[PDB]
């Protein structure tokens, strides 16, 4: 049960011209990795939102959450 579709990630890998063929587990692995990183961002961003009583994540909470989480900062700097 992934929120990221294994189907489209597989198609995005095939049309991406990365290799000849794509293994069946590759879009599964990539979709979970893509889903984990967003859940990591949206949590810290969602935290900073209601830590300001904001009921909506705005670009500031994305900027703050990634920037002072230096793991996410070294990734999306």
């Amino acid at each position: 049960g992934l929120q990221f579709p294994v189907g489209r990630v597989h198609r995005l890998l095939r049309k991406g011209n990365y290799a000849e063929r794509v293994g069946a587990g590759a879009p599964v692995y990539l979709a979970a990795v893509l889903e984990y990183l967003t859940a990591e961002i949206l949590e810290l961003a969602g935290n900073a939102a209601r830590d300001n009583k904001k009921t909506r994540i705005i670009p500031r909470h994305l900027q703050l959450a990634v920037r002072n989480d230096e793991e996410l900062n070294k990734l999306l700097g």
Partner: protein
Amino acid sequence: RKESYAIYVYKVLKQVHPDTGISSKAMSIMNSFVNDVFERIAGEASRLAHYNKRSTITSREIQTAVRLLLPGELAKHAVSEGTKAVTKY
């Protein structure tokens, strides 16, 4: 950017914060993070595959690129998310 992941980012946001929304301007920033990481993971996995004279991007080549590109425990928990994910069919 190139591909839209907005609905999938909407999916996970309700799992993490069901009562906290996201702006459209921030959703565009979220969509840019995913598009950037997607091409980095898939790009390095293709370099890893092309190098070992491989014609198949598998889950181990994706797993390696995740280890090389994501820093700290970002890669630790991402590899855990990936290996658990393919462990279902």
